[PDB]
Amino acid sequence: STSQVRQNYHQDSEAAINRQINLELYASYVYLSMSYYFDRDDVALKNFAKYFLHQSHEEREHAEKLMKLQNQRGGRIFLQDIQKPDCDDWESGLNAMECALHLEKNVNQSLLELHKLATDKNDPHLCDFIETHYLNEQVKAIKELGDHVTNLRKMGAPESGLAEYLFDKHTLG
Amino acid sequence: STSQVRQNYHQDSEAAINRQINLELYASYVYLSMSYYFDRDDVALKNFAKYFLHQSHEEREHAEKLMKLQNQRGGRIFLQDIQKPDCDDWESGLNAMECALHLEKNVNQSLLELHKLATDKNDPHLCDFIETHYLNEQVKAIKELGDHVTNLRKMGAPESGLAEYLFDKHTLG
Amino acid sequence: STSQVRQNYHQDSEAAINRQINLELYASYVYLSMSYYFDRDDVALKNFAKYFLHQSHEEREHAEKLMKLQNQRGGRIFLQDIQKPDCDDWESGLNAMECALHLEKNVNQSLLELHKLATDKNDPHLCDFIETHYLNEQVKAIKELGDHVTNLRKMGAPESGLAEYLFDKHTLG
Amino acid sequence: STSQVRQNYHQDSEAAINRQINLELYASYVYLSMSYYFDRDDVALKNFAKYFLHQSHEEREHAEKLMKLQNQRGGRIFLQDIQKPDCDDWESGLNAMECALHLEKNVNQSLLELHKLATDKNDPHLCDFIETHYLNEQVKAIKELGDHVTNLRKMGAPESGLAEYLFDKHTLG
Amino acid sequence: STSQVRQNYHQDSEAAINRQINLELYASYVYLSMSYYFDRDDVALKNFAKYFLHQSHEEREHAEKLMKLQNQRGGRIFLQDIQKPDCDDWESGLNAMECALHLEKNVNQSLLELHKLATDKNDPHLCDFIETHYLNEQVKAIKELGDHVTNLRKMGAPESGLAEYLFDKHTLG
Amino acid sequence: STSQVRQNYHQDSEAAINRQINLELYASYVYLSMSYYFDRDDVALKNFAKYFLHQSHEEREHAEKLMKLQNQRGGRIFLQDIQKPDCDDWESGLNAMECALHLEKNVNQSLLELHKLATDKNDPHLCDFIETHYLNEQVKAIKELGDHVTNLRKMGAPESGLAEYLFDKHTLG
Ligand code: NA
Ligand code: NA
Ligand code: NA
Ligand code: NA
Ligand code: NA
Ligand code: NA
Ligand code: NA
């Protein structure tokens, strides 16, 4: 049953990739929930909505690239249920940015564990894939979200509705 | 707690839309699974893979349009778990097309029930939304999939690997 | 006699690069043999011929890039005889694709051993060179060849001459 | 006091980056000194001047990219004094090229030590950053400078003023 | 040892130019420190960062133009250590603008002393160089920084984080 | 076992073409070795390197054209080992040009013997092929290499490193 293409690809690596696929799809789902929270008539921050929808689509692309990797290496994709997000109501732009920062740090931690597994199994292709396509993207996302959190807090969010309004216009527009 | 925008929008309609959101996301997930099955080194039908990935992205757009509708009408989106597809291994191009036909008929049946509910609650905006954006799209998808199933069966699929190869090139390429 | 440029470059790494140069030139020669087999009047599969000639030229470029690396690092190139391929007659498009898959897996195995040596000698430049320019190229080549083998086998090669003819036209054309 | 962005970033790595910042700024300063030596009326080698000024600006960009990295990772930049170069008078084009080769090998050695520290602290983002942006750039610079030294020596520098003149015109122009 | 080009160029003028070179490089270093302070995840004012990086590069150009002058006149450049800035942490956009204003006034004072020395040594070329390339540039920089300080103070900086945010967007963007 | 295409093509001609294929591939390998000798940090003559790499690729094209001829005529290609060049170290640009001249005269001698065999076997197609595609190309290559040898010797190579430097720039650049 071994793939004709499979070479230097450990069963533990294959299992870890399947877990990372699920986590990227989960992240996509979280961002989708956030997006449509800011589209509510009683929230009405269109650029917050756009920002999180973009992040939702980016996470879906990250999941598809891992699925492609799994087939390239002769692993087998096993999909699992995509759990619903932890919240229906994300409270404020500041609260959503903070939850996004926490999500991205959790995804980064899972990728650092995958890199460590690849290095331990002497799988340099997999380690290089993670470094090239995932690790810098995560560091950038985490720095951006931290910048956003900082600005919203300095501007006086979440108490000042003016702060979220102006951030939506000037930073996210 | 009633939305300032909410008018002539029944709680039963709001609940039905939330169920339809989940079903569209489920369908997206099924098509994603199918796509990456045909990307396997031991299946290797690239145009089958492309066809199902396109259908996956289309279903995601259909889910997002229902989320937009729910906010337009002053309903509240409640997301649920996205269940994993029924199969990991889709067996053949003919078998996947047949499962896709069955999926699309199931989605169509849910939309016909939503239309009936909208008509029963005297919600013409919702009924028109379903007719305009969903019902013809479903009839077209079902006719296309039935055409594909017919052609694959006449060509001698799934037994003739030549049939699936040539269908992939000539119909899906 | 140490090069003025040489820094953190082990004699074992220099020797391994010289062996990899020979293996890339060998691979180029194998693909050249395959190419001109399919140009025979009694084989006459022009797109098989084109495919393998392209692969021959790509392998020559891979050998030249290793020669450039050896000089960049202050190593010394020592060329060896290029052994003749194992076959004069490659039997069928399916048989040549299978031999190509086996060749590429052998080259990949040698590169994975070179990466391991670079990591063991704490030569990150060399390890990065191998990851960046060789490891993903090999994974892609191996997945492509496995896809080709799969399609030819499903189509009914090598017994169906129609299969090889249509594969030549539709996949390789 | 931990940055909200900081993840898997050791205090020893942060300290090493601060040292590398200083060394890149130092290198920039050395090249600036060299540049304006060749602009002297009693030296008057304009293309030597241009070559070293370009290298000065490149080293400043390398320092700024490390400063950006330090902030991306949630480290804190601590700048130190930029020590003056070892020479005011660089004697000849050959002597400056030789000092440049020695400088670049010293910078490369510091980067190889930073890579080793990143690998020891299991910081793959940092290791990849160094490999991607620094290690190949250094190998190329060292090979170029060694080529220049070789050509100047073969041409008869530093004794032949004709050699430096013609090298300035033909190689550096 | 007198340069063949040297004419009407006092040793005191040559010494003063060497001091001004050091001060321009020092100023460049101060602005670089300021720039990367505003790039911190906990400060996150991108247009403040851009403004000070531009000023850093401008000061480096001013130092290089003095180095060119020193060679034009047959003086000899003697570089000194570039002292580290007085602060690692610049506290606020208002505090950095105020420190920048103080820096520019200090540089202007040194240039006015150089002009006075040139006039006292009857060096009209040097006096004209300073007037043409330095004195108006300094008056403009000082007026701009004073305008910025005024606006930030009127807007309610440094206490209002909204003030610095909006200044960053509207004045520096 | 006779090819359906084979007409007026002697077994001795087929054998001679197979020997000429090997000699063209050998020549390609010699030129490749020469190329990367001049790319060494301690040789560093880039236009010598380019010249010989071009000649390497031209010889490979000459071998492929003979392989095409062998199939056109219904002969069968039998590849042999490609022997390693006689030298690893080519000493100087003058020494490499002299070895190249000797190589080209050896290849020309083999082609003149092939033409004589074709004429003796009354194979005018083969004789015309050799005259049209090989004999003038060889006369031109031999005249060019003799011109290069003459110029390098008159300029004072190999003793004058200035000679090789200037030849590299002015003739080969
Ligand atoms: Na992701
Ligand atoms: Na749908
Ligand atoms: Na290769
Ligand atoms: Na890497
Ligand atoms: Na550098
Ligand atoms: Na200045
Ligand atoms: Na030839």
From Swiss-Prot, chains A, B, C, D, E, F:
Result of altering residue 19 to A: Abrogates interaction with NCOA4. Fails to localize to punctate lysosomal structures
- GO biological process entries: immune response; intracellular iron ion homeostasis; iron ion transport; negative regulation of cell population proliferation; negative regulation of ferroptosis; negative regulation of fibroblast proliferation
Q: Which domain of life is it from?
A: Eukaryota
Please state every residue range assigned to the domain named Ferritin-like diiron: 7-156
Q: Which cysteines are joined by disulfide bonds?
A: none
Locate the residues binding Fe cation 2: 59, 104, 138
Which Gene Ontology terms cover its molecular function?
ferric iron binding; ferrous iron binding; ferroxidase activity; identical protein binding; iron ion binding; iron ion sequestering activity
Q: Name one GO cellular component term.
A: cytoplasm
Q: Where does it live in the cell?
A: Cytoplasm; Lysosome; Cytoplasmic vesicle, Autophagosome
The keyword Zinc-finger is assigned to this record: no
Per the record, what is the consequence of mutating residue 104 to A? No effect on iron binding but the oxidation rate is severely reduced
Top enzyme class: oxidoreductase
Q: Which Gene3D superfamilies match?
A: 1.20.1260.10
Q: What is the effect of changing residue 24 to A?
A: Reduces iron binding and oxidation rate
Enzyme Commission designation: 1.16.3.1
Tissue expression pattern: Expressed in the liver.
Keywords per UniProt? Acetylation, Cytoplasm, Cytoplasmic vesicle, Iron, Iron storage, Lysosome, Metal-binding, Neurodegeneration, Oxidoreductase, Phosphoprotein
Q: Where is this site: Essential for association with cargo receptor NCOA4?
A: 19
Q: Which family does it belong to?
A: Belongs to the ferritin family.
Cite the record's note on assembly.
Answer: Oligomer of 24 subunits. There are two types of subunits: L (light) chain and H (heavy) chain. The major chain can be light or heavy, depending on the species and tissue type. In the human liver, the heavy chain is predominant. The functional molecule forms a roughly spherical shell with a diameter of 12 nm and contains a central cavity into which the insoluble mineral iron core is deposited. Interacts with NCOA4; NCOA4 promotes targeting of the iron-binding ferritin complex to autolysosomes following starvation or iron depletion.
Disease implication from the record: Hemochromatosis 5: A disorder of iron metabolism characterized by iron overload. Excess iron is deposited in a variety of organs leading to their failure, and resulting in serious illnesses including cirrhosis, hepatomas, diabetes, cardiomyopathy, arthritis, and hypogonadotropic hypogonadism. Severe effects of the disease usually do not appear until after decades of progressive iron loading.
Provide the function of this protein: Stores iron in a soluble, non-toxic, readily available form. Important for iron homeostasis. Has ferroxidase activity. Iron is taken up in the ferrous form and deposited as ferric hydroxides after oxidation. Also plays a role in delivery of iron to cells. Mediates iron uptake in capsule cells of the developing kidney. Delivery to lysosomes is mediated by the cargo receptor NCOA4 for autophagic degradation and release of iron.
Which protein is depicted? Ferritin heavy chain
